[PDB]
TrEMBL record, chain A:
<protein>
    <submittedName>
        <fullName>Uncharacterized protein</fullName>
    </submittedName>
</protein>
<dbReference type="GO" id="GO:0005739">
    <property type="term" value="C:mitochondrion"/>
</dbReference>
<keyword id="KW-1133">Transmembrane helix</keyword>
<keyword id="KW-0812">Transmembrane</keyword>
<dbReference type="GO" id="GO:0020023">
    <property type="term" value="C:kinetoplast"/>
</dbReference>
UniProtKB/TrEMBL annotation, chain B:
<keyword id="KW-0812">Transmembrane</keyword>
<keyword id="KW-0472">Membrane</keyword>
<dbReference type="GO" id="GO:0005739">
    <property type="term" value="C:mitochondrion"/>
</dbReference>
<feature type="transmembrane region" description="Helical">
    <location>
        <begin position="98"/>
        <end position="121"/>
    </location>
</feature>
<keyword id="KW-1133">Transmembrane helix</keyword>
UniProtKB/TrEMBL annotation, chain D:
<protein>
    <submittedName>
        <fullName>Uncharacterized protein</fullName>
    </submittedName>
</protein>
Automatic annotation (TrEMBL), chain F:
<protein>
    <submittedName>
        <fullName>Uncharacterized protein</fullName>
    </submittedName>
</protein>
<dbReference type="GO" id="GO:0005739">
    <property type="term" value="C:mitochondrion"/>
</dbReference>
<dbReference type="GO" id="GO:0020023">
    <property type="term" value="C:kinetoplast"/>
</dbReference>
Amino acid sequence: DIMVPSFVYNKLPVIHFLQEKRAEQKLRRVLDETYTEWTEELDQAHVTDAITRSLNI
Amino acid sequence: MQGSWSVLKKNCSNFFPGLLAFAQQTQEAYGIWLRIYNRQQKYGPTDFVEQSETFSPDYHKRFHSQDKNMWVDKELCTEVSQKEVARLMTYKLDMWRMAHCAGALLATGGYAIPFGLFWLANDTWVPSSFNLTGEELRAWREAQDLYRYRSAPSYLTDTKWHFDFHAYPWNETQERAWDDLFEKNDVRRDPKVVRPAAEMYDGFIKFELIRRKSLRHLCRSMNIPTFPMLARLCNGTRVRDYWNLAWCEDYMVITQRLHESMTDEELYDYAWRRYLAPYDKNLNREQLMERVEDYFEFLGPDFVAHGKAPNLVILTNYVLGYYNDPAYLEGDISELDKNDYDHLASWGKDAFLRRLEFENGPLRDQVEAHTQRLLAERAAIAK
Amino acid sequence: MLLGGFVPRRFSQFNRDPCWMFFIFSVGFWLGEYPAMMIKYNARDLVYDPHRYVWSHHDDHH
Amino acid sequence: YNMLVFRDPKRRPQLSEEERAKVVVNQAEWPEEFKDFDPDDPYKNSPEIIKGMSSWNLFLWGVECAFIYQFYELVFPKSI
Amino acid sequence: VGNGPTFSTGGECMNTCDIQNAFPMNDRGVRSSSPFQEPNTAIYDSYLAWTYFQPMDVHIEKLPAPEAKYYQRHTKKPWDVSSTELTEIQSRKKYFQTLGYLVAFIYLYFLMPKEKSFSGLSGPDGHWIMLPKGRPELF
Amino acid sequence: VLFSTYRSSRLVSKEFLHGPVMRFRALGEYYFQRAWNGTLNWALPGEYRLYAVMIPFIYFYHRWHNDHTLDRDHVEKAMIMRWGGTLEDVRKLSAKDQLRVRCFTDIEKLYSAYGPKDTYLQPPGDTLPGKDFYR
Amino acid sequence: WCPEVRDRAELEVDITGWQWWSPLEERRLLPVRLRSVNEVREIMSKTQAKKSA
Amino acid sequence: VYTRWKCDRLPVFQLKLFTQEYPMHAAVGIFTIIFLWKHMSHCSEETERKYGWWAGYPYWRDPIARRNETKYKQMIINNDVDITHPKWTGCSVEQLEELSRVV
Ligand SMILES: CCCCCCCCCCCCCCCCCC(=O)OC[C@H](COP(=O)([O-])OCC(O)COP(=O)([O-])OC[C@@H](COC(=O)CCCCCCCCCCCCCCCCC)OC(=O)CCCCCCCCCCCCCCCCC)OC(=O)CCCCCCCCCCCCCCCCC
Ligand SMILES: CCCCCCCCCCCCCCCCCC(=O)OC[C@H](COP(=O)([O-])OCC(O)COP(=O)([O-])OC[C@@H](COC(=O)CCCCCCCCCCCCCCCCC)OC(=O)CCCCCCCCCCCCCCCCC)OC(=O)CCCCCCCCCCCCCCCCC
Ligand SMILES: CCCCCCCCCCCCCCCCCC(=O)OC[C@H](COP(=O)([O-])OCC(O)COP(=O)([O-])OC[C@@H](COC(=O)CCCCCCCCCCCCCCCCC)OC(=O)CCCCCCCCCCCCCCCCC)OC(=O)CCCCCCCCCCCCCCCCC
Ligand SMILES: CCCCCCCCCCCCCCCCCC(=O)OC[C@H](COP(=O)([O-])OCC(O)COP(=O)([O-])OC[C@@H](COC(=O)CCCCCCCCCCCCCCCCC)OC(=O)CCCCCCCCCCCCCCCCC)OC(=O)CCCCCCCCCCCCCCCCC
Ligand SMILES: CCCCCCCCCCCCCCCCCC(=O)OC[C@H](COP(=O)([O-])OCC(O)COP(=O)([O-])OC[C@@H](COC(=O)CCCCCCCCCCCCCCCCC)OC(=O)CCCCCCCCCCCCCCCCC)OC(=O)CCCCCCCCCCCCCCCCC
Ligand SMILES: CCCCCCCCCCCCCCCCCC(=O)OC[C@H](COP(=O)([O-])OCC[N+](C)(C)C)OC(=O)CCCCCCCCCCCCCCCCC
Ligand SMILES: CCCCCCCC/C=C/CCCCCCCC(=O)OC[C@H](COP(=O)(O)OCCN)OC(=O)CCCCCCC/C=C/CCCCCCCC
Ligand SMILES: CCCCCCCCCCCCO[C@@H]1O[C@H](CO)[C@@H](O[C@H]2O[C@H](CO)[C@@H](O)[C@H](O)[C@H]2O)[C@H](O)[C@H]1O
């Protein structure tokens, strides 16, 4: 009725602070590991060159 | 789970059939254990067979060493099948509880009958053989899962608090592993990220140094009876034997890929015996397979290569993390519009409260300026 | 721990808070019981018990 | 100030001198209870809990109670 | 504003405590008395310093109410008792205990006589118990 | 199965005696739940008014108990031993005589070890009764 | 309405964890904060160069 | 979540506290209680007279004698004891009658 309640009350602030920091850490990780991926596609010049070769030119 | 009259009737009706089934299972499990023990004594390492002594560095108290006193029989499939191992494990649990009850009966004579009535009214400590139908078995599994939910968080919190209060991780990867190890089951933990915690805790506490209170919590979470607990080297032996059997079965399955061919109910039971898949979650085959693969990944390549599993304390914490449900929150957000101290409104504010409101209210700057100017004037006059 | 609370500056302010009102009442009782004992136990008509030498606690505890 | 061992708490200043000098004091907005506020006597204008009940009256009430406690048996003695 | 209490402090100054970092600091440089953000926190200097927060009427941009799905967790268990329910139970129990203790205090200090009085006018002088009955062979 | 081991098994409704309980909690919280009410190991609070109120009350009830229950025994013993050695002998006196005797006992209490010793030592030649008066 | 804190505190106390200060965990988590845009640019750049190589 | 102090009722928590938290202390306390009630639970009549009364023993009524008289009367009446038996008196009934006629 008296002791354990008081010590729980004393614990509350530190735990709240640490959990807030942990959540911030996880969202920070979410944004950190995002990168824009630029894909590379076969240049159409080679396609045009192959078309010319097929024509026997 | 709390006792009930319906469960009491169920267990009273199935008492004698349950005892007969338990006796048959006892014969079968004795045969299986005889095979396993003969194989261990014949092909086991010298340290494992001779029971090498490992003493703590502080009080020199002997306890089982994970490296030396635990051995994975890679060639056990020749003599014993996976199903036989699972049967032996289940019978070990049932036999432990029945043995404790029988010890109480022998100790107290005929005065244990009312305590037996309390016992049969709850499925927490009755053997699985007392259930003769699917619904009864489901209720029994629900009771076991409830006990696991009740017990696991205390063990996890004990471990985490002691480590965090008396030590800190060495490097960032260890920090991430430690933080992610104790996440709630609503999120998926990556075993590769979490594995280094095993080595870190080996640096902190090995299985040979496990404290008696943490052992009690663990045994509670594993549905192992704890009264009389006695010395820590008895339930510790029980835990070592259970996890050694589990590791042998896991090696068998990994090598032979039995889990892929394993059926849905058998797969669910296999996960449950590893404390990975509660029955109340109503998991499907995909989730069970994901959890089992994560468990195998956490064991790591070294388990297959040499039969060496990671630190048992961290392994138990990891697997029991699936019973660490998110903290309950019930009630609409509108409830936050109420007030908690309306009953004090009639009392009003006394002189001191009015003074505090005046000094620290919106006029606080003016009051501070006036007070400081007056004090400065008085000090100047004094000089 | 004696951290804070209402503190009257002087006697006249003790009536600004019920608790200090009770406190000053109690202080009045405490200090006024002494003059009463002076008057009662130094009275002219007060007479020692004639039988005071018949018995005393000193003989009993001895 | 002090009343025996009971010391009056004092609020620590929070504003710097530069910011403080720029503050305009308007006692018209202050409550009537706290006007010409003095840290050494903040409760000078505080209302009495009971109108007409002075501290000396309560002190005298206690003294009279003590006198009754000590003198009642002199006027209305009772047998053992 | 009301007269209600706030987050308990224990009579401690948060600008010098061992867990001060857990208490947010405001613009004035005064750490809050609670994990919440407080704009008007102050410090009072008695024999020991202590932090104080005065409630006030302040408007805060209220984010709209979310859905129940994203903040309700239905993991309640039969053994679970909420803090509000615990407070209710303890309040009732302590009320009854207070009444009982009040009655006991009154009886003890104003009605109960002391045992073994010299005159015999008040209190018992004691007596024997557990005496044999219906056992002639005992004598 | 007969009795629950969990505190969650309620025996009454949540609204049972809500009002009186709220009044009691209001009485408890108004002076105690404050920042300046920092206790020392739960025994010594920081609020001055708590001391100012509780010290006098404790002293008052303790003194009432001592005066009307404890010292009364010594007073009665003195009255009985000095005036017959029996209760009836004392009751043979009038109320005023008993008052005189009890006030003399109070005098003796006040003197204690710092006062004249003729209150209990009979000087030689004194004509007052001795210890063998009633023997 | 902040159940995680409640559960952690109650469990810590019920397992003989009376102490209310955790200097080590705070030291691990004290400097955590959301990054600035420029820091995000730099970190994404390192990730991209890593992916390329 | 489950905690012993918050979820269990008071008797259960008491048993748990003194069986899995402070069992040795409870054992020592019980040992000491037994010792006290085995060796420090008696008070002779003379000791009661010397120290057992707040203001002193009132010899003018001797309440101890009345207490013992009530005790012995109750024992005799309930147990049907013949106090005139030769063992209690050390002489035959006829000798007792002769003595009564003499004195
Ligand atoms: C109603 C019934 C009432 C019953 C009353 C009786 C008492 C209770 C009964 C039992 C209760 C249940 C629980 C008991 C404790 C369980 C402990 C436990 O968990 O052990 C696990 C443990 C199993 O773990 P393990 O891994 O297999 O092995 C342990 C590891 O080695 C561990 O490794 P380690 O690293 O820890 O190694 C250290 C380990 C090593 O030890 C062991 O573990 C080995 C086993 C114990 C060996 C003990 C014998 C040692 C040699 C004795 C030599 C004596 C010579 C004397 C010659 C005299 C010639 C004149 O421990 C020690 O070193 C301790 C040594 C013992 C020291 C004793 C000091 C006594 C000081 C006396 C002071 C003065 C007294 C008063 C004055 C008297 C004189 C006037 O069990 C054991 O080893 C044995 C357990 C035995 C249990 C007790 C059996 C009781 C039988 C009772 C029979 C009589 C009944 C009478 C009834 C009367 C009417 C009612
Ligand atoms: C009539 C007199 C009575 C005397 C008073 C008794 C008072 C009550 C005390 C308790 C007595 C025992 C109660 C029955 C237990 C059931 C049998 C048993 O041991 O189960 C195995 C099981 C072994 O546990 P574990 O942790 O797995 O063992 C680790 C070993 O490494 C395991 O080794 P492993 O890993 O190599 O695997 C081996 C395993 C492999 O086997 C299997 O896997 C197959 C299954 C085998 C076990 C089956 C057990 C079935 C239990 C249920 C039975 C049905 C109950 C039905 C109830 C309803 C009835 C209507 O087989 C075993 O379990 C063998 C264990 C060693 C044998 C122990 C028995 C020794 C005593 C009997 C011989 C006495 C001879 C007297 C000669 C007299 C000369 C003058 O026993 C327990 O669960 C332990 C008992 C739990 C309660 C402890 C309570 C405190 C005990 C303190 C005793 C202190 C000394 C006595 C004085 C006390 C004064 C205060
Ligand atoms: C036919 C059947 C088949 C054959 C038989 C088979 C064998 C059967 C036997 C074996 C069964 C084993 C399994 C049993 C499981 C159930 C155990 C149990 O009780 O569970 C709690 C059980 C409820 O269980 P549940 O609801 O299922 O919840 C289970 C949860 O999982 C909660 O689980 P948990 O883990 O949280 O609960 C555990 C809890 C278990 O404890 C409890 O829950 C406490 C239970 C009692 C609570 C009482 C509350 C009410 C009090 C009322 C007071 C009186 C009121 C006024 C009455 C007025 C009447 C006119 O705590 C403990 O475990 C503590 C253990 C303490 C051990 C103590 C050891 C002492 C050793 C001494 C020191 C020695 C040192 C060495 C010295 C060496 C020297 C040489 O409690 C009850 O049902 C309460 C019953 C209350 C009965 C009425 C009150 C007492 C009546 C007394 C009558 C006396 C008559 C004679 C008077 C004569 C005067 C002259
Ligand atoms: C506000 C006021 C309210 C009222 C307050 C009342 C007043 C209380 C004042 C004092 C309270 C504190 C006293 C503390 C004493 C010191 C304790 C101490 O040193 O403990 C050390 C130590 C601590 O225990 P632990 O094993 O470390 O863990 C304790 C935790 O509680 C284990 O917890 P866990 O969570 O780890 O495990 C939970 C679960 C885990 O589940 C299991 O383990 C499965 C189920 C196990 C069932 C039991 C298996 C027993 C196996 C055999 C044990 C050895 C027997 C030895 C020989 C017999 C000796 C008699 O276990 C249970 O649920 C246990 C159920 C037990 C129910 C009975 C509890 C007592 C209720 C009262 C019944 C008796 C009333 C008699 C008086 C009235 C007569 C008219 O004790 C032991 O080593 C245990 C030895 C047990 C020996 C047997 C009992 C000896 C005492 C005499 C029994 C007399 C029976 C009379 C029958 C009727 C005759 C007419
Ligand atoms: C139906 C009940 C059970 C029946 C029996 C069942 C089967 C046997 C059980 C076990 C027997 C153990 C035998 C002895 C083992 C070795 C130890 C020893 O040397 O013992 C010496 C001696 C026994 O004598 P003995 O060796 O058998 O041989 C006779 C000799 O010729 C005598 O030679 P001596 O020179 O030693 O003789 C001096 C004197 C020496 O006697 C003593 O020193 C007495 C010591 C008592 C110890 C009590 C232990 C438990 C303490 C719990 C914590 C209490 C904290 C403080 C609370 C204060 C406020 C209440 O011996 C006696 O006259 C013995 C009388 C014992 C009567 C026991 C009555 C217990 C009452 C407990 C009241 C609790 C109130 C709580 C209220 C809370 C409400 C919210 O004392 C004891 O053994 C004391 C412990 C007895 C425990 C009995 C079982 C548990 C209690 C059951 C009854 C509960 C009643 C509750 C009433 C509630 C009313 C509101
Ligand atoms: C005016 C005079 C003033 C004198 C003042 C003197 C000092 C008094 C101080 C009192 C307060 C401080 C007390 C501190 C505690 C002291 C403890 C103490 O000495 O107690 C000893 C005493 C010794 O007991 P005992 O006096 O009955 O000894 C019996 C010995 N015989 C039979 C030979 C006479 O302990 C007890 O009283 C408790 C006994 C019961 C509890 C223990 C039972 C188990 C015993 C185990 C061994 C024997 C059995 C076999 C093993 C078990 C089998 C199941
Ligand atoms: C177990 C009894 C078996 C034999 C049948 C006896 C029936 C006697 C008639 C009873 C009529 C009144 C019943 C009232 C409801 C009782 C409900 C009850 O038991 O609640 C227990 C409740 C505590 O509840 P919790 O611990 O919070 O948890 C409860 C949920 N787990 O206890 C109480 O509040 C006390 C209630 C006492 C009711 C009276 C019980 C009388 C029992 C007598 C048994 C002896 C035989 C009687 C034979 C009578 C023949 C005419
Ligand atoms: C009341 C007591 C209750 C006891 C309950 C438990 C009983 C258990 C009995 C197990 C019996 C096992 O049987 C025993 O097994 C071992 C190990 O294979 C055999 O051991 C044999 O092979 C091993 C391994 O190569 C050799 O080290 C050993 O020298 C040789 O004898 C024994 O020859 C056999 O007798």
